[PDB]
Every structure is written in C-alpha cells, then in structure tokens.
Design a protein around this ligand. Sequence first.
Ligand SMILES: Cc1ncc(COP(=O)(O)O)c(CN[C@H](C(=O)O)[C@H](C)O)c1O
Ligand SMILES: Cc1ncc(COP(=O)(O)O)c(CN[C@H](C(=O)O)[C@H](C)O)c1O
Lengths: 405, 405
Amino acid sequence: MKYLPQQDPQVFAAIEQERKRQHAKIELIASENFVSRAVMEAQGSVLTNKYAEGYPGRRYAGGCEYVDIVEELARERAKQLFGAEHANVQPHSGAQANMAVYFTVLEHGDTVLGMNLSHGGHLTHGSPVNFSGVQYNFVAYGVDPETHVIDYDDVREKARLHRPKLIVAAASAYPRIIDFAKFREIADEVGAYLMVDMAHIAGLVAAGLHPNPVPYAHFVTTTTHKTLRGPRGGMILCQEQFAKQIDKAIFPGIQGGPLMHVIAAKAVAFGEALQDDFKAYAKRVVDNAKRLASALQNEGFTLVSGGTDNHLLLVDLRPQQLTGKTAEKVLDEVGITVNKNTIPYDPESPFVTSGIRIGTAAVTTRGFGLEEMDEIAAIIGLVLKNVGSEQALEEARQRVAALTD
Amino acid sequence: MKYLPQQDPQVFAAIEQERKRQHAKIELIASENFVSRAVMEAQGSVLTNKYAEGYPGRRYAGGCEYVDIVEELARERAKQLFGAEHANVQPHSGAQANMAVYFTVLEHGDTVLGMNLSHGGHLTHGSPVNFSGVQYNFVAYGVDPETHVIDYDDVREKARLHRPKLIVAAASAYPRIIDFAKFREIADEVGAYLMVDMAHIAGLVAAGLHPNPVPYAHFVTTTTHKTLRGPRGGMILCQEQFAKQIDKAIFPGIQGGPLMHVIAAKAVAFGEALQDDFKAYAKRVVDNAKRLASALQNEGFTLVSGGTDNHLLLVDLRPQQLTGKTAEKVLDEVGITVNKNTIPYDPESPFVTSGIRIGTAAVTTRGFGLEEMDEIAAIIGLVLKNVGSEQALEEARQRVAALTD
Ligand SMILES: Cc1ncc(COP(=O)(O)O)c(CN[C@H](C(=O)O)[C@H](C)O)c1O
Ligand SMILES: Cc1ncc(COP(=O)(O)O)c(CN[C@H](C(=O)O)[C@H](C)O)c1O
C-alpha cells in the first residue's frame, strides 16, 4: 500500500494489525480462507466506479462494454467449473444468493423444507430471526442422533407431511457427504424444487471430491469465499429454464447495481480453480481434515459423525465437560481460532453450545500438511485437557508460534 | 498491479480497458463518481478473509479484534459526518440498506408511501418488479406537472387516504431540494415513520449544501458510492431507539457476514468527507451542475423543474422530438456517458423515455470547472441538434477528446 498510509493512518494501522494477525494465528474457522494477491488486486480496481445495472449486453447504463467482458468471464468460467447451464455472479453474498432463489419460486408464507439449524443447517435455511423463517414457513429435517448423518427417511417423511414447494439441502456444519440423488428423489415424489446451498463444499465440488449437486438440483447457490478460495460474495447456478427468472430476481428483484470489482475477483478465483494446482490443493484440504479428525480422536476427542468426508469437523466436547464457548475462549488465548458451534441434539443454547467447528481450508492454503495436522491436534489436546493450567497454555502459545514460522 | 497480469491476462486486459475508458470518456451518470486510491487499496486488502458476523465486540467468531476497530471507525465517522445517533455500515448496497429498514418496521403487505418512480422515485421505493412493491403495498405521491417539484399537498392527501405505516422520501432523478420538515409534519399527522433515502444527495448533505434529513427522519438510508465519493455499498443512519432493531435487521435479518474490506474503504471515504477539501469539492459539484443547467438552457434545452438545486439535472427532450434512448445512443457514439431517464408524466415507456439524466459529481472529481461545463453543454447541443450529421459527431468526438487531456 502507498496512498492509504498517508491518507488514513488509523485505518491503515488496523489493517496492518489484521494482516499480521492472519499470519500469526492458526486459522481454523471452516468458512474462512486466504485469497491470492491477484484476487485482491481485482477488488482494489477502478471497477467499483461503474454502475452496471442489468446484465452483459442488456444494461441500463452506457459504458459497460468492458465490465460486460468481466462478468461473462466470471459466468462462463463458473459454468465450465461446475457444468451448469446458467450462472449468476451478481449476488452480494450467500444470503442474497439464497434470497434470490426464494424470491423466484416462492410466494410469502410458502412451506419450505430445510436442514435443522442445530443439526448443521444454516441461518438462511429457516431461522425465525432470519428473513427465511419470517418470510416463509420453514420445516426441518434432522440427522440420526447416534450417527449424525442426514436421516433421508426423515427428509422423506417431512416432505410428504408438510408438502413443501421447495426443498433445501446443504449445511454450515455438516462433516459428511450429502446425497443429492436422494434429495431429488424425495423432491420428485412431493413435486418440489430442489435447492442446494453448496457454499461450504463449493471448492471440493470443483475439484471432484464431493458429488456435484448441479445435475440433481434445480437451483444451486454458493458463496465464493469459502473452499472455493475467492472473494467475499455469492453465486447462483441453475438450469436454462430458470435462467431468466433468476436474473430478474437479482435485478430488479432484490439487488441494484452489482459489485463489478468483486465480480472481477470472482472470475480470477474461478480461473485459479480451473487450474490443476487447485485440484491438488482441495485434495490436501480433505486429506488434512481427515488427518486432523483421526489425530483429535487419538487425543481422546469425540467427533460428530465420527470423523469427516469434507473440509470441516465438529468436536463433541461433552465428554470433557466443556462448552464450545469455553473452548473458543481458551483456544483464542493460545492463538488458535475456532468458533463455538451447536452439535446435533445440543443440550446447550446456540450462544453457549457443546462443540467447536474446525476447518482445514485456510491452513492448507498456507502450506500446512499431514504433519502440521498432528501438531494442531496435539496443541488442542494440551489446551482443552488442561484449561486451568497457565503453564500448559504458555507451552501451547510457543507451539502455535512455531507452526506459524 | 503486479500479480494479476501474470495470473489472469484476460481479466487484467478488460480492467485496463475500463481504466482507460474512465479517463477517455466524459462521465455524466448522476450516480457515478471516482474513488481515491486510498479507498481502492482498502478494498484490495486482506480484510476479505475475515468472517465478522455480528457487530464490534459482539461477534459470532473470534479474531475480530482489529476489524472491530475498522467498523467502529466507519460508524463513528459517519455519526460525526451526519450528526446521527446510530450508524450501520454493513449494508452490502443501497438496496439492502432500504430492505433492512423495511424489514424492521413493516410486516408483509403493509402500506408504504413512496415517490412516484416515473417522477423521480427509485426502484426500491415500490416497483412492482422489485421486492419493495411485491412485499409491501406501495402507494405513490407525485410532482406538480408544470414545475416538477414535489407536491406536498399530494403527499399529505395520499398519506391521509392510504394511512401508510411508513413514508419514504428521496429520489434517483430529482433535481430539487427535498423538504424533510414537511415530510415529517405529514408523517406525524398520519402516525407513520419517516425514511429518507439520501443516496444521491449524501455527499451534499455532508458538505451542508442540502438540508440534513437526520433531525427529521426516524431512518436515513444511503449509498456510499454516489456524491459521498466512497466504495460501492450501503449505510443506515437512525436514532438510538431503533439502533438495536436496525442491527438485528441487517444481521441475522437479511444479510450474513459483512464485507470488512469495503467497510474499511467506507471509513476512508468518511474520513476524506470530513476534511475541508471535500466541502469545497461538493460546492463545485453544485456550482458545476447549476452552470451546466444554465448553459444547456442557453443551447435551447428544456430542463425538468427548470434547473437544479443539487448534483443532477434532467433534460426534457420532447421539444427536440428525441427520446432518451436515442440521445443516450448518439452521445455514447461521441464519448459522452449519460443514461436515458423517464421524465415526470412521460408519454414514453421506462425503456424508451423522453429524457436524459446528467450529474456533475464524476467530472468535478477529475477537476472540471465552470468553463468545462459550458463546453460539455455546447457539445451536447451540437450532437442532439444534428443527430443525422456525421461531421458534427466527428467534431464532437474531437471536442470530447480535448476536454479529457
Ligand atoms: C451454507 C451457507 N450459506 C450461506 C451463508 C451466508 O453467506 P454470506 O456470509 O456471504 O451471507 C453461509 C455462512 N456461513 C457462516 C459460517 O460458516 O461461518 C455462518 C454459519 O453464517 C453458509 O454457511
Ligand atoms: C436513491 C437510491 N437508493 C438506492 C439505490 C440502489 O443502490 P445500490 O445500487 O447500491 O443497490 C439507488 C440506485 N440508483 C441507481 C442510479 O442512480 O443509477 C438506479 C436508479 O437504481 C438510488 O438511486
């Protein structure tokens, strides 16, 4: 940076603190990742100056000739990446991506079937304090209380009873592979649309390490910033028959002018995702997660679903008689960044929780391998089995500092 | 740029084309502006990597210590700039800023009174193809058919008849000063909340060249990218009594994780707005607009409301027997960037129109003064009075190229 340090010393100092923080800490938040310098330069471009309401070629303002190319590059690369018939790269976020689909196929008060929020489901999948639960009549399916795997007989029973117009699959904290073939089979029986929110697994889908929902779902929403390792924003993939309706839902439906500089960075992210190295990266993410899962069990930790098939895992902290809130606080003290997360059938409130969510996407980008996963798990064991001991937490700090160069 | 040209030659080439376009063309789109290099560097920072769901101090993820400072800087500077009791700098856009307020004080199907869309009102103020008109029962007030100034007796009659829960003031294409004192007086009579969408006039309000809606309105929404000359995004200002409700409406209401890198750029933009030079800048914008308005009339153009009190003007093209669509196309051919815009009581559809919207905010940032405004108006006269003549359009191209160095 050059012009910011002179103009705004206060903001620059806080950014420099954050930059140094991201290097010093062990980042294990499942939804986070580190973007390339090419992605950041695209978001720091003059493309923020342009109003490009509408779509490539069909704009409601002149001078969009070159931002049209940018958006088309983002749209075509995403279609190439996921094998989708249509792409919309204008959603400001995953929340707005989900919102636009709901706006398309649903009237106010319609019944929608989503995943239980305390079982792994997301806020936009029917939270009564979120727009989804207020605007629509959301019913929930759950996981098996023993295995923590989606009970597909329960998805079928809930769909046949409540008769939803839409079924939502996918989650924020689900460590296993989602059977999209079964979700479509259930949706076909009850005559409902199938939406898959692949936000967390998007990068793994692109690398072919998680089944692609695209052939099975009518709508596929995602964020670009999670395992896809791109800028902060949303995307909608759909079939050509819904293309016009989805486009009208984004604009003039729920949004206005798109973020052309972010869309530029999305294109850069999709470009990087198409390369062979990203497929090797994503395999390391899954390898690292399974290694970390196995190593934490070795330390004596119970895991939700008994491991992982993807990028994330959930530690059931009930055996250690610790809340997720307590674990989040003490690991923050030693330099490990996690978040408290409700486990399926949690006896604690969503603000206290009985578990912690851990992802490997961020550390894998940094260069962390199977060896580092053993150490990370060893530090977590040292901290959570000796919460009252300050000497163990000091030992943990030094071991965290050793891993981060 | 350094890492982008190597990584993505296709995207970099399109960005470089856009960068050169923004310099070569005369940008007169009323909603557009040029951001400083400090604002862009903040959007190109590592702050995109952080999930900061919630608010400063009250986050739902660890490691937010430094992005909290960033958001607080953005919030406090905006409060200092506008004299507001509470600020929310998390809205992804002006559309989401408006959406959050609607989500706060309104139930589905509630009656809301906004400005007529063909008279100057915005898409989010009750368009039947926008979320606002679908989710809520929007009624409209208009302008006087002769003077094109808001008919405040009509605002009062519509409010007393339809009994709205909310009244919306402000516009996308209104060249005059809005009397917020009268809007609150009407709202108090019918027992309705007053929302002001100052998106277009935000920078002029900050410089004290347009009356501040904050003392009169319960809610004030805005975009940061128009006359405020900041990054692409939204902001909500409100009284302390609505602070908690507005915060809950953004998250977990309608959005998810905020754009911390954009919020950083908002802080930089607000910082630049507080400086004395920005107040001088904004006065030049208004001076330039009034100069351009007077000069276009001298050329024989009829203007909506007979001039301007702000940053923008509307040319009534009916005397020249030209549509806004025709004017937009031919001016694009010579390097002048405007947009077609419906005039009050337009005989043409919103896709054809009888007028063009022109703003001075962008050209003023570049260094254009009163002299350049005379020339811009002279070129517009040459083009629109000689549409069939290619020799006049070639003359116009050279005169446009002369103004842009
Ligand atoms: C599966 C899923 N869909 C949408 C979103 C929201 O995206 P955005 O923040 O851009 O609006 C999420 C967000 N996930 C968060 C996280 O994992 O930390 C949190 C659970 O909301 C999501 O997981
Ligand atoms: C008065 C007003 N409020 C909100 C918006 C939408 O903001 P965003 O694009 O960030 O969602 C606008 C947009 N204005 C556009 C323009 O002037 O070019 C257009 C009329 O929508 C607005 O004017």
